[PDB]
Every structure is written in C-alpha cells, then in structure tokens.
Design an enzyme around this catalytic site. Sequence first.
Site, PDB file in Angstrom:
ATOM      1  N   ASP A   9      32.258  56.942  12.419  1.00 50.72           N
ATOM      2  CA  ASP A   9      32.007  57.292  11.115  1.00 50.72           C
ATOM      3  C   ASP A   9      31.433  56.137  10.163  1.00 50.72           C
ATOM      4  O   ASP A   9      31.957  55.097  10.270  1.00 50.72           O
ATOM      5  CB  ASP A   9      33.063  58.165  10.253  1.00 50.72           C
ATOM      6  CG  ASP A   9      32.920  58.714   8.836  1.00 50.72           C
ATOM      7  OD1 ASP A   9      32.002  58.728   8.526  1.00 50.72           O
ATOM      8  OD2 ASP A   9      33.835  59.174   8.291  1.00 50.72           O
ATOM      9  N   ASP A  11      31.242  56.541   6.119  1.00 43.61           N
ATOM     10  CA  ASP A  11      32.100  56.256   4.777  1.00 43.61           C
ATOM     11  C   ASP A  11      33.460  56.530   5.434  1.00 43.61           C
ATOM     12  O   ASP A  11      33.873  57.658   6.112  1.00 43.61           O
ATOM     13  CB  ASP A  11      31.457  57.286   3.849  1.00 43.61           C
ATOM     14  CG  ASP A  11      32.135  57.272   2.481  1.00 43.61           C
ATOM     15  OD1 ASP A  11      32.995  58.219   2.136  1.00 43.61           O
ATOM     16  OD2 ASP A  11      31.684  56.216   1.912  1.00 43.61           O
ATOM     17  N   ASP A 335      21.121  15.727  14.131  1.00 43.29           N
ATOM     18  CA  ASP A 335      20.824  14.635  14.817  1.00 43.29           C
ATOM     19  C   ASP A 335      19.384  14.329  14.412  1.00 43.29           C
ATOM     20  O   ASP A 335      19.120  13.627  13.386  1.00 43.29           O
ATOM     21  CB  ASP A 335      20.649  15.152  16.317  1.00 43.29           C
ATOM     22  CG  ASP A 335      20.496  14.170  17.202  1.00 43.29           C
ATOM     23  OD1 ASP A 335      19.418  14.207  18.032  1.00 43.29           O
ATOM     24  OD2 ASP A 335      21.423  13.104  17.469  1.00 43.29           O
ATOM     25  N   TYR A 466      12.153   8.459  20.077  1.00 43.38           N
ATOM     26  CA  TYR A 466      12.778   7.328  20.102  1.00 43.38           C
ATOM     27  C   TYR A 466      11.997   5.884  20.336  1.00 43.38           C
ATOM     28  O   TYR A 466      12.347   4.772  20.664  1.00 43.38           O
ATOM     29  CB  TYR A 466      13.868   7.249  21.405  1.00 43.38           C
ATOM     30  CG  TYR A 466      15.180   8.052  21.353  1.00 43.38           C
ATOM     31  CD1 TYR A 466      16.311   7.592  20.827  1.00 43.38           C
ATOM     32  CD2 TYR A 466      15.168   9.266  21.848  1.00 43.38           C
ATOM     33  CE1 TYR A 466      17.378   8.346  20.771  1.00 43.38           C
ATOM     34  CE2 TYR A 466      16.187  10.062  21.633  1.00 43.38           C
ATOM     35  CZ  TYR A 466      17.334   9.702  21.210  1.00 43.38           C
ATOM     36  OH  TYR A 466      18.362  10.360  21.210  1.00 43.38           O
ATOM     37  N   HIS A 524      29.574  16.062  18.766  1.00 44.84           N
ATOM     38  CA  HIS A 524      28.137  15.922  18.295  1.00 44.84           C
ATOM     39  C   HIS A 524      27.346  17.147  18.231  1.00 44.84           C
ATOM     40  O   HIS A 524      26.465  17.135  17.323  1.00 44.84           O
ATOM     41  CB  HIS A 524      27.515  14.856  19.404  1.00 44.84           C
ATOM     42  CG  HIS A 524      25.993  14.761  19.169  1.00 44.84           C
ATOM     43  ND1 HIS A 524      25.402  13.980  18.245  1.00 44.84           N
ATOM     44  CD2 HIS A 524      24.998  15.312  19.554  1.00 44.84           C
ATOM     45  CE1 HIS A 524      24.246  13.784  18.240  1.00 44.84           C
ATOM     46  NE2 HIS A 524      23.797  14.920  19.029  1.00 44.84           N
TER      47      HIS A 524
HETATM   48  C1  LIG Z   1      20.012   6.106  10.997  1.00 46.20           C
HETATM   49  C2  LIG Z   1      20.369   6.510  12.362  1.00 46.20           C
HETATM   50  C3  LIG Z   1      21.605   6.890  12.798  1.00 46.20           C
HETATM   51  C4  LIG Z   1      19.354   7.601  12.722  1.00 46.20           C
HETATM   52  O1  LIG Z   1      18.961   8.235  11.699  1.00 46.20           O
HETATM   53  N1  LIG Z   1      19.368   8.112  14.086  1.00 46.20           N
HETATM   54  C5  LIG Z   1      19.343   7.174  15.247  1.00 46.20           C
HETATM   55  C6  LIG Z   1      20.259   8.029  16.279  1.00 46.20           C
HETATM   56  C7  LIG Z   1      19.672   9.439  16.613  1.00 46.20           C
HETATM   57  N2  LIG Z   1      20.381  10.397  17.539  1.00 46.20           N
HETATM   58  C8  LIG Z   1      20.848  10.559  18.845  1.00 46.20           C
HETATM   59  O2  LIG Z   1      20.405   9.354  19.513  1.00 46.20           O
HETATM   60  N3  LIG Z   1      21.223  11.517  19.426  1.00 46.20           N
HETATM   61  C9  LIG Z   1      21.596  11.687  20.688  1.00 46.20           C
HETATM   62  C10 LIG Z   1      21.497  12.817  21.072  1.00 46.20           C
HETATM   63  C11 LIG Z   1      21.723  13.174  22.699  1.00 46.20           C
HETATM   64  C12 LIG Z   1      22.057  12.046  23.418  1.00 46.20           C
HETATM   65  C13 LIG Z   1      22.169  11.972  24.791  1.00 46.20           C
HETATM   66  F1  LIG Z   1      22.657  13.212  25.237  1.00 46.20           F
HETATM   67  F2  LIG Z   1      23.048  11.073  25.105  1.00 46.20           F
HETATM   68  F3  LIG Z   1      21.025  11.763  25.751  1.00 46.20           F
HETATM   69  C14 LIG Z   1      21.890  10.645  22.837  1.00 46.20           C
HETATM   70  C15 LIG Z   1      21.833  10.478  21.566  1.00 46.20           C
HETATM   71  C16 LIG Z   1      19.153  10.234  15.374  1.00 46.20           C
HETATM   72  C17 LIG Z   1      18.363   9.392  14.238  1.00 46.20           C
HETATM   73 MG   LIG Z   2      33.416  59.594   6.565  1.00 45.32          MG
END
Ligand SMILES: CC(C)C(=O)N1CCC(NC(=O)Nc2ccc(C(F)(F)F)cc2)CC1
Ligand SMILES: [Mg+2]
EC number: 3.3.2.10
Lengths: 548, 548
Positions: A9, A11, A335, A466, A524
């Site tokens: 139901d 209400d 991240d 990276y 993380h």
């Molecule tokens: C100022 C720094 C800290 C910054 O802005 N950053 C550097 C670090 C970066 N993040 C990561 O490295 N994340 C990460 C995520 C996953 C893994 C892994 F799983 F190990 F592969 C390793 C690292 C995010 C951007």
């Molecule tokens: Mg009802």
Amino acid sequence: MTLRAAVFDLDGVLALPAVFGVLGRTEEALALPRGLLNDAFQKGGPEGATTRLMKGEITLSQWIPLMEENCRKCSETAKVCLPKNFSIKEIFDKAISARKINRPMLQAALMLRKKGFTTAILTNTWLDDRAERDGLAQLMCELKMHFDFLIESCQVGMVKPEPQIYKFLLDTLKASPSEVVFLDDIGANLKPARDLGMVTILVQDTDTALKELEKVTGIQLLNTPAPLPTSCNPSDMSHGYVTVKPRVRLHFVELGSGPAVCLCHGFPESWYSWRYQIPALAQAGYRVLAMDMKGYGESSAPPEIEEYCMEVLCKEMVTFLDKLGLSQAVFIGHDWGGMLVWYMALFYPERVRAVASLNTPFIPANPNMSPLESIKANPVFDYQLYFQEPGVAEAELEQNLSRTFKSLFRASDESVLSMHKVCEAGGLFVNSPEEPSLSRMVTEEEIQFYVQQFKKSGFRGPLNWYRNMERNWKWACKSLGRKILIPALMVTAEKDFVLVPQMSQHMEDWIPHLKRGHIEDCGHWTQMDKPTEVNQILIKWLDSDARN
Amino acid sequence: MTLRAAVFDLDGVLALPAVFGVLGRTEEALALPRGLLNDAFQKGGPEGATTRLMKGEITLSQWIPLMEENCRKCSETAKVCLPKNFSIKEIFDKAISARKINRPMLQAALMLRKKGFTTAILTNTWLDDRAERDGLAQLMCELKMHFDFLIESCQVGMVKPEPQIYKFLLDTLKASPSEVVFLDDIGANLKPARDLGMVTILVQDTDTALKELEKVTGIQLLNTPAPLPTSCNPSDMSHGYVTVKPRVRLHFVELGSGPAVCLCHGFPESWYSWRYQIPALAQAGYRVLAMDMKGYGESSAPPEIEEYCMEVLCKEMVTFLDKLGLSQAVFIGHDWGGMLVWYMALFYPERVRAVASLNTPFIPANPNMSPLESIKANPVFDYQLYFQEPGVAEAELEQNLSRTFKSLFRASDESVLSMHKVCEAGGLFVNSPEEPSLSRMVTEEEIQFYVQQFKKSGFRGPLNWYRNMERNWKWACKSLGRKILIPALMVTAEKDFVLVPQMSQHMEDWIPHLKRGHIEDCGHWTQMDKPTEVNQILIKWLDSDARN
Ligand SMILES: CC(C)C(=O)N1CCC(NC(=O)Nc2ccc(C(F)(F)F)cc2)CC1
Ligand SMILES: [Mg+2]
Ligand SMILES: CC(C)C(=O)N1CCC(NC(=O)Nc2ccc(C(F)(F)F)cc2)CC1
Ligand SMILES: [Mg+2]
C-alpha cells in the site's frame, strides 16, 4: 509454490502521515462533528465523486469542488455549518506534503527485493493537477524506481478492494496468489486478496507489520543493518556524448535536476566509481553529470601524451560546459579528478559554481624545484616513476584486467597492494596473487563492468595523465599569485596511504575559506569504501555552499 | 591578400555600457575629482595592480582591495577624502551587469562570418571570482559560441596594446595582418595593430563604426535584414540516449539549464525540426531536450504497429523522465508531437509542468462514432487512408529521400504538394517533380541531414503513428470526463491546410485557461516557416506560465 512476491500500500504503508489521518485530525482541530469530512469523502460509495477520482474518470482539481459540495450537505443534515474561511484545497495540500516516505518499510522492500523477490506497489491514487502537484510527483520517482512495478488506480481504471484489480496485479506479477504477500492499512483492502489465497498483513504500527512479513517470508527485515546507498544500473542510465574537439568525444551519465554537478574520477576508474553518489545527489536536488574522463571508457582515448596535460584537459571541460549550454557547474573530483577540479578553480572561476576534492589536496608548484626531482624526495611516490616509460606499465595492467582491478579496489583493512620499491620489484603486482580475493567493496559483477570498459582502450590514455609532470609544473606556475576564493571543500581519507591527509594541511594558505570533511577508517577508494558518509558530507556542503 | 578575418573588442564594441564609462559616470554621481577613479585603476601602469589582473597573475577579488587602496592615495594627493560608505565592489558589480551585448555589432559579426570570414574576440579581461560572477559567465557563452575564437588577456598572459598578443592573434587566426580587420574603442589598442599592417576602426558610436567595416569589407552590414535565429550544428550538440525498455532507446539533444523543456516533432521529422528553438530557448533560461521520437533517427524504430499507439508512446516518455531523474517537464509538441503532448497532459499531469502545441489541436474522441468513419467525412484527411496499408506508403517515400523531403518542407507561398484525391491519384507525389526546387525554408545541406536520418530506418515506424486510430480512439475515451487545467498554449498557423485553425475553436470547452498564439502567413512547417515569432511566442509563455 510459496512466496516470491511483495506488494505494498502507499498511503499508510510506504508513505506516512497517511492522508486519511489528517481527514480526521482536522475535524478535531476545528471542533467539527466527528467524521463529517470522512463521510463527504466516501459520499456516493462506488458511484461517488471520490471513486470516479480514483478511477481516472476525473482529476484532483476536478474533484475539489464536488468534495466541498458533499461537505456542505454532510453538515446540512448534521444540522451545523462549516467555518466561513473553509478550504478543502488547503487541507489536502498540507496533508499531501506533510506525507513522507516510510523509510523502514521501503528499506524492507529493498531487502526482500535484494533477495529475488518481485516487488510492486498497489495504490488507490488520483490524477494530480493541483498547482502544487510536483511535490507528490517527486516522491513517486523516489519510490517507484525501487520496484518492479507501480500500479495506480487512476491509471488502470480499477480500484482497491475491487477484485479485478488484484487479478490485474497477479497478471502483472506473473504470479499466483499464494506466491504473493500484500501489506495494507485498510482491512477492506485486505479481504479480496485473501479470498484468492494471498498472504496479507494489516499494517498499523509499522514495525509489528514488519515482524509479520519477517516471519512469513523467513528473512531478517527488522533490525537488518543500514544498507548501502542506491547504486546505478548502467543500462538504465542516460548516457551523454559531447564531441569537444575534432576527435575527442566525452561521455557521461546524467541524472537529476537543479544546479549541475560534475563528477571526475581518478586513476584507473570510470563514471561508475560514483555509482553511490549519483542517485543520492540527484535525489538531494541536483543534476549530476558523471564523466568518463578523457582516456577512459566511452570517452575518446587518443595516444599522444600531451593530449593529457592539465591545461589541455581543462579547456576540454570548459568546452564540455560550452557545448551543453552550462555557464557554471559544481566540480567534485577524486584522485586525479581532484587536481583537475582544483585547476578548474584556479583558471576558470567564472565556470566553477563550487569546487570539491576527495583525497587529492592542492599543492602549489615549487617554481625553483623540478617535479621529477620533487617526487623522488618521497618513498611512496616511487610508483609514479614506474608509470613514466610508455608501455612498460601498460602491459602489466592489461595482462589480466580482472586480476588488475581486483588487486586495486580493496579497503584499508584488506590489502594485497603495496606502495614503494615498485621500480626495483619491477611490477606494480610483482608480489600479488593471480586470483585475488573479492573486496568487501565490490561485487564480482562490478569488477567485470570495469573489465568491459578497459577492454576498449587500455591504460595508454589513463597512464598518460602521469606523463605531463613537466608541462603541468610550468602551466601551474602561472597561477602562483592567485588564490581560491570560491566555495571549496577538502575531504580527507584517514588511511589513504598516498593521498595522505597531512599533505593537505597548508591548503588554507591559498584557500582561506576552505571548508573540510574527514572520513575515519577509509582507504583510497573513497566513494566505494565509505559511500554513505561520503554522500552525507557532500550533500550537506552542496546545500550550504552551492545553492545560492 | 586582402581581408578574410574580423576581430572585435569586448568592452565598448561587442558589449555596451562599457565598464570604463561607469568608472567616470560614478565620479560625477558622487562629486568626485574628475578621473580620480580612473587614475587608481591605471595606477602603476604595466607594473600595477590592474595589469597583473588582466594578465591572470591575480584575480578580480584579489584586485578589489588593491584598487580601493590605490583609490585611497589618488584622493590623498588630490587633498580630499572618499565617502565613508564607499565600495569598489558595488560599482563594478552594477557596471558588469549593467553591460549587455551590443546587438548590431554581434549581428554584423555574424553577417561577416556567414560569408566566409574567420571571426574572433580580443579582450583585456580578468579572472572573475566575485560572488556574482555567473552573470558575466552567462554573457560569454552567448557571445563566444558565435565565433571562431575568443582570446582573453588573463587567459593568454599577454595584454592589449602589447605587440606579442597581436602576434598571438595572427597565429591563432592562421593569418597575416593585411588579411585582418580589428575594431576597438581605445586608440592605444588600435596602433600596434596598424604597425603590423592591420585594418583598424576606432569604435565610438556603433553605427559609423559599422559604416567603416561595411565599406572596407565590401559587404552590406548596416541595415542588412533581420536574421534567422541561431541554428544548431549536429556535431557540436550533446546527444543523449535512454533505453526506455528492453529494445527501445530514445535519442535527444540537450542544451541549456533550468526547467526542462521537451520538444516533440511531427510527421516525418527529427529533433532537427527544432534547430531554431533550441539555442533560443536554452538562451531564454531553459534546459531543452529535443527528441527523436520513437520511429525516427537515432531513436529505435521497431516494426510492430502497436508499438506506436499514443498510450504506449506516452508511458515511454514517462519512463524517459523517470530514467533521467526529472519529476516534471514542460511539453511542447508539433504535428503528431502536438497530440502526444496533449495526451501527456490528460493522463500524466503530475509530470507535465506545462503543455504547448503548434498547429495540432485537441479534439476529444467521439465515443459513438468510429474514427475510420470520422476521417472519411472530410476531403483533406484522405491522405491518412493512403497511409494505413503497411508498405504501400513507404515505398513511395523511401524511393527518393531528397525528392521526398524537398517535396514536403515548403512554405505557404510555395507549394508543389497537394492534399486530397491522394488515394485515387495513387501517390502522395503522383503529380510532383523528380527534382523539386529548394524551399526558402531549407538549405540544401539541411535536406541532406534529413536524408541521412531516414536512410537508417525508413518510414515504417514513422508511418505507424497513423495506424493506431482504433486503439487510440478507445484509449482516449477513458479521458472523456477530464479537463486540462494546467498551463496550456495553442499556437495556430494561418495557412496550414490540414491543421487548420478552426479545428481548435472549441478547445476552451475542455481547457478553460488555454492561452493562445497565432502566426499569420505560416504553413504547416511552423518551426522553419516562422522561427522568430515561434521563438518569441514560446519564450514569453514559458516565462509567464512555466517558471513558478
Ligand atoms: C598534488 C598531488 C598530490 C596531486 O595532485 N596528485 C598526485 C597523485 C595522483 N594520484 C595517484 O597517484 N593515484 C593513484 C591511484 C591508483 C594507483 C595504483 F593503483 F597504485 F596504481 C596509484 C596512484 C593525483 C594527483
Ligand atoms: Mg492505504
Ligand atoms: C485531432 C487531430 C487533428 C490530430 O491530433 N492529428 C491528426 C493529424 C496529424 N498530422 C498530420 O497528419 N500531419 C501531416 C504531416 C505531413 C504530411 C505529408 F507531408 F503530407 F505527408 C501529412 C500530414 C496530427 C494528429
Ligand atoms: Mg574596449
């Protein structure tokens, strides 16, 4: 053939303060002859105004006067008069909004449904054309999207205690009466069910109601733990696609209405990383757009490394906003997503309604020091070097996508992935299992979702993020005299061993009104490690800082 | 190498009330020493606060105090004091919003660009982090999305009169100085240009400015006619996709923010039929979602005829709303879209924020009379019979898609497609040309856009919408006791010879607050026949009826 279905139901069962309990309440409030209103309401019986309403023959606004009229003569025979400032419209208005979802009941409907039970709603409702009709409309999506079916009287043209509607229900349920449980607050509504052989429960106080179900279904329902927030089913999402540039198209998933909120995931993830926040925030009053960031998933992932520096990446979003018609958006990242959000704040404030980061702090670049130098001065960032040489890092990640995701998405109290000596060791996984155990954070299926995505374009693109340390250092030095003076929140995770929460400790030097949030006992992968508090923190800051 | 480029100042050229003309205005308002403010502003010259601002070194909010401080001592040496309730923040706030787009200038930038000219903006601007920064942010999308480039000082790190920025412009323009015209309101900003050999115009009053360009470019710019509203480039749109059901996915294009507005096109069209209303309405303050309706384009087009009755079609949208997170939406339809919108009003009011139809009236079904009967009693609806027999009608339409669209999309004063004896004649086109001439309403390319779409799935699906007369008659009789009491607008087209405007004359019987609009000199293809008044009428009714 015992139970596998559950019917509720509205209400008085799934939604409380039930309207009818105002019907009366009011009378008392206004010294009216007990039940006067309730007669007017039922006046005519099957052939009366209220049934026609419930059947769809007419509409709420159409009915308001007929009710008032009925009320007139319910009080004429009761030898009485109504007040002179009397309003059937107001009453139902207050009542209809007064009414909110019954949480434990819904939660129990989830619980059952989570365990193979086909769930439905059966309710005697009306066609709402009131000037204020949205409020109810709102509530219905929140509910209905947790059920296999929603069956409304005015939609089917039959009413609830009339047999033929139960027949209609069975038909819809693909079921037979003894396979189905049906909860309701009216006894009259119960009886027909039983006559076909249905399990029925008279709902009065909600949690004896639950006791009955609990037992007859043989499933803990009361006192069952707090459950994870609603997730998303990718196939039932709206997928959006913006080609932001000749050969770069960005994909996103979109749900909700209100101020736009853009979620940007971190290394190696997908818009799916936000599965727990999408319905939550949408629900909280927002239009969420969760990106596949460049390099991932159904977004484009072009080979060249330059194609992934912060500056390029940032313009692309600004375009994304452009081509969607959005002057601003709130930006929340995690991240890598974190840092990018930060650079949207520093370089395009007119576009960022507010800014938010999980885990990833803001560090201003050191204009003297090289960054390839800077990372070396820190045991834990050793992995980022491993990621520099195009190709090495990819073969290891792509080698086994299950193994790989399964080895990453693991909670603090859970690991089989360590941080340093990663170059010496000569593998991210050099010393982890071929069939790693399921984390508490992920179903098996969820992992496979990710496996699909990354079969498309691998880690070349993602790993590129990276590979612009130098360029980004340079770009970043342009903003060294600026500050973030827009709404900005820094959410820190206790046990994230890389985006450690000390790293953020001076951020208030360059962001002087930075609000904060902090998650105890959180690794993380914030959004699947502590989704509920994550949702709690974010919605509250949105409401306070991002609305007006 | 003569001209093929056009570059515009912002403040004082493309946007008026220029800020600097408030700088002074104020002084006068407050009996301040002439120019006091303007000195403070330029204080320091190249190495002063305002340049750093313009360069991106710092931000608007960062600069407010430095200005006020400068103002302090501009008035200390002028042996004077400021008022005690004095606010640099307020001044610029009022000023920055006070400023609106210079329309004729923009229109001229269009005109030129329409004729092969690469257009750009060059402006000395700042990083806006004011609490109220969106207003400007808004204006910039409205502008920028009509230019090849927008080059901002604080974005490039160079300023306007510094040479290196002009070099930067040429580079961006892929051009050489004598191929480019540059309009500005500051003379100092002009000179560098010339030194490289640029055509320059000092913009004072706007329309002598235009005269100069007009001449040096050899293109009517002043006094040029009113131009069609902005169209959409499909490749630069956000495309959305919702699978609403196991094998039905619906496609749409989405632009804007605010209250959702759903546009539903008529027989045989595409979301592209709304090309003129999308930017307009988005611009007016809305989130437009323009559907490919079921059967068309990138939406799914399943064979079965039932799959296209109003009732099925309606639920599908309701789902569409569901899976996108929208509790309500404003519904505007045309042709078939019209009737469907109407039935969304009658069957799902809680979902329809307001309702709007171009051409298509609401007729309640005659519950005595069969509709296959009803249509026969009317010379002009003879074509609908032609469409009943699956397949006949399709071969003729699919035979030549260019011929076909070209034969349909034609304006009132223009036809080569007639209405009746269509069955006897034994073709919709039995008596029309193989290479029909281009209508004033469509480019050649536009026609080809349509040709692409319909190469996907033909007319089976679209022609199905005409094949549920019976079922829909029945469904419709359910609503015979209802009324539309939600915001609702009926736009009538003088010369549409099928959706004739008399047909709508009793609609106020079932829709008692129906607002209206009426287009003189307008054939059936409303949205490309009279786009501007169409936009005018719709935006005004949205603003009045659909906001709150
Ligand atoms: C100022 C720094 C800290 C910054 O802005 N950053 C550097 C670090 C970066 N993040 C990561 O490295 N994340 C990460 C995520 C996953 C893994 C892994 F799983 F190990 F592969 C390793 C690292 C995010 C951007
Ligand atoms: Mg009802
Ligand atoms: C109540 C009636 C008027 C109604 O709602 N209707 C019936 C008429 C229908 N519209 C059309 O028939 N449109 C149309 C569009 C194009 C053509 C064609 F181009 F001739 F083929 C012919 C007809 C729209 C829905
Ligand atoms: Mg200027």
